[PDB]
Design an enzyme around this catalytic site. Sequence first.
Site, PDB file in Angstrom:
ATOM      1  N   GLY A   1       0.798  -1.223   0.000  1.00  0.00           N
ATOM      2  CA  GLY A   1       0.000   0.000   0.000  1.00  0.00           C
ATOM      3  C   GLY A   1       0.821   1.258   0.000  1.00  0.00           C
ATOM      4  O   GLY A   1       1.627   1.476   0.864  1.00  0.00           O
TER       5      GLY A   1
ATOM      6  N   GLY B   1       0.469   5.559  -0.367  1.00  0.00           N
ATOM      7  CA  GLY B   1      -0.558   6.569  -0.127  1.00  0.00           C
ATOM      8  C   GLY B   1      -0.033   7.763   0.624  1.00  0.00           C
ATOM      9  O   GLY B   1       1.184   7.911   0.830  1.00  0.00           O
ATOM     10  N   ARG B   2      -0.957   8.619   1.046  1.00  0.00           N
ATOM     11  CA  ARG B   2      -0.602   9.941   1.596  1.00  0.00           C
ATOM     12  C   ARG B   2      -0.227   9.779   3.063  1.00  0.00           C
ATOM     13  O   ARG B   2       0.565  10.534   3.599  1.00  0.00           O
ATOM     14  CB  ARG B   2      -1.774  10.926   1.419  1.00  0.00           C
TER      15      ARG B   2
ATOM     16  N   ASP C   1     -10.797   8.433  13.555  1.00  0.00           N
ATOM     17  CA  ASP C   1     -10.591   8.179  12.125  1.00  0.00           C
ATOM     18  C   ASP C   1     -11.145   6.817  11.676  1.00  0.00           C
ATOM     19  O   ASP C   1     -10.553   6.150  10.831  1.00  0.00           O
ATOM     20  CB  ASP C   1      -9.094   8.278  11.779  1.00  0.00           C
TER      21      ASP C   1
END
Lengths: 293, 293
Positions: A9, A11-12, A130
């Site tokens: 993975g 991602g940011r 979150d």
Amino acid sequence: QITLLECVGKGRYGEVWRGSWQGENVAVKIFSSRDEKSWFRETELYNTVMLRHENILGFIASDMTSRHSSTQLWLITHYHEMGSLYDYLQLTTLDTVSCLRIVLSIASGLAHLHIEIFGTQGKPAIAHRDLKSKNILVKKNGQCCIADLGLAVMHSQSTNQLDVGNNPRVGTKRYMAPEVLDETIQVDCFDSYKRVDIWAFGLVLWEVARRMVSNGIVEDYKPPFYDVVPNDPSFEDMRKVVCVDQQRPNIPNRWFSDPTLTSLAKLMKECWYQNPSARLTALRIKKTLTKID
Amino acid sequence: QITLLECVGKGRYGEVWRGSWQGENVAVKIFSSRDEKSWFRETELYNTVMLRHENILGFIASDMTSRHSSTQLWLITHYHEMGSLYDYLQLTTLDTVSCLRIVLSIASGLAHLHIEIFGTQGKPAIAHRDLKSKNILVKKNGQCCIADLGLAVMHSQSTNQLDVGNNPRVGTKRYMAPEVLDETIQVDCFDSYKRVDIWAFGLVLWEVARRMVSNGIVEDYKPPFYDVVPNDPSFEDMRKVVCVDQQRPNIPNRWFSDPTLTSLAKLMKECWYQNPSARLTALRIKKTLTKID
Ligand SMILES: CC(=O)c1cccc(-c2cnc3ccc(NCC4CC4)nn23)c1
Ligand SMILES: CC(=O)c1cccc(-c2cnc3ccc(NCC4CC4)nn23)c1
């Protein structure tokens, strides 16, 4: 010693690798520069609090290393080869048994976060801040566990000082609750954060239920509010959908054929009130889904 | 698992305990709230850099725990029961052999910090930024090792970007170099920090030498500039002694009877120039003290 093997993975939020710790398969989240603080809060939580639970992503270690004469922050956890609930739902469709198990375990895990416990295996109360489908991991026995505690908040009845840390990051705007999208959330009160967690559980609930077959039909996977906001929605986007127009995810009318989907629909409706004092608690949710079948 | 046994130091930097790790004697520095950042930089250094050296305080682990529903930051190192060079010098007087060994090892340790090394046991260059007698520990074989890296700075010829972190703490004002007391130190240049380390070594040198007997006489222990500044000197105090009046620690005239003390005096004089470009390097210092006897 640890060796990254296979990046699963990018991602940011950084990267997640499949690694080995002493040949044992594990997951290494390499945090990006933008999240130092999230590595610290999460390393703070896992080390100072016992979190050992079947439905919380299991911790092994936190560590600092140097690739390229520069420091990387690793978190090192259990690895779940099926991956995130988000990926799983796209890949597959669900029957009643598998649906409830998935959603029961999210609630059996969130409840455990939410409550204070005492004694030798005790813990303060924790809010996640979150909760989403990408932050839930699916296990070979088809129970889920909650990942990513970098935004979390703690509280004890023992002390009664709130520890919100100081993390400049916010939630995922897609799952933000209306009080948060308002900037009217009272940051002084701990329950605010629980209730924010409950909202996000309602939307998660909604994402999963779509993938349960009944009368031989499912809806495809969509993220919440997929019909009314673009990918990577502005803060002012979600605000107008949730706060101003006051919208929510639709219940498909086929769900009202099925008692399980009607029950879960009754339930996620109770997670979705604009007033946070009115939403259910995780423990209610857990015990409710315990009865449903 | 770790158990603190015996607090050996309380102070503004926090506390140092004698502990056990699995029954093994170790030292646990509990950092105070005021130093979070110093725990991070120091945990960053020890984990991302190999520092294994006889004259650098040996690292075992860094950890986070919770006393009183609140988080403590521990560093866990080797324990040296004689304690700090500061305490040792008060307790005792030195002959030539023991004097040189102490000061050789400080330089054998600082040099190792100061230089870049390549290969399997390599390391970037490091500056300490807080060298003093309280940050040096004395070992049963009467060699010293350098503690406390919470202010340290790194550099490689491999990358050539300077990593000064972001620590709001400064040095100990008693050992601050004139460029630092000026606020004219060019923070952009790495050698600045080395040279600042060399200054402080000159003052350390001066503290130790006083405790070496020659013609049956020593001076008592004093901290540097003890005669001209009060305990806990203002920034504007040290500034006027070092920058304005341009003063330095006196050489006692009895030292000029002895060639060793005259040599070390020649040497610490070379650490004490107002222009930093003019001071010696640690490696010169090391190799010089290697010849002296
Ligand atoms: C969700 C998250 O932040 C996290 C943190 C540490 C380990 C893991 C973990 C463990 N096994 C897997 C398998 C796949 C996976 N995907 C990472 C993308 C979905 C967020 N993460 N993952 C996830
Ligand atoms: C000098 C310092 O910051 C430090 C950090 C970790 C361990 C130790 C250590 C190991 N053995 C001892 C024995 C005594 C001691 N004294 C602490 C006061 C002198 C700074 N510190 N110490 C010192």
